[PDB]
């Protein structure tokens, strides 16, 4: 139920939010909303046990 953002194109300013969820461009081919090679979702879910 807990998620963190690990992919971004820039660094956060102090006291600001970023709730946008688009597929990060980790390469050169465009993701176009579809995950795959060099295209990773920025929201990774936690696995607490």
């Amino acid at each position: 139920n807990y998620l963190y953002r690990l992919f971004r194109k820039s660094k956060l300013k102090p006291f600001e939010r970023d709730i946008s969820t688009e597929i990060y461009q980790a390469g050169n081919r465009p993701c176009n909303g579809v995950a795959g090679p060099n295209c990773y979702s920025p929201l990774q879910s936690y696995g607490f046990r």
């Binding site: 300013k13 102090p14 006291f15 600001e16 939010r17 709730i19 946008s20 688009e22």
Partner: protein, 101 residues
């Protein structure tokens, strides 16, 4: 009023400081999922209305001063310091802005 935000309609976070003449409303809409609501009276009131809007560390500081103007073509040559009016901890990007007509 003025619309602040990264995009025009959606996909990011936006701002809305729309106002009318009868009640001076500062209703801050954070719909784009409401996360910040605020409303108070004083925002506004041949006259020149000088304003300063800033965004430092997520704080929206608004200055305001009303000054009578004569010979309204070009800009006057004088001094009239602006006073602080409204502080808002909105905490968003504020990439660009658009004036509401």
């Amino acid at each position: 009023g003025w619309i602040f935000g990264t995009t025009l309609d959606s996909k990011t976070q936006s701002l809305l400081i729309v106002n009318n003449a009868t009640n001076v409303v500062i209703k801050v809409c954070e719909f784009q999922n409401c996360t910040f609501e605020y409303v108070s009276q004083p925002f506004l009131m041949k006259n020149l209305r000088e304003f300063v809007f800033k965004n430092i560390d997520g704080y929206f500081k608004i200055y305001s001063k009303h000054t009578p103007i004569n010979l309204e073509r070009d800009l006057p040559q004088g001094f009239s310091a602006l006073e602080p009016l409204v502080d808002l901890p909105i905490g968003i990007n504020i990439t660009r802005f658009q004036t509401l007509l």
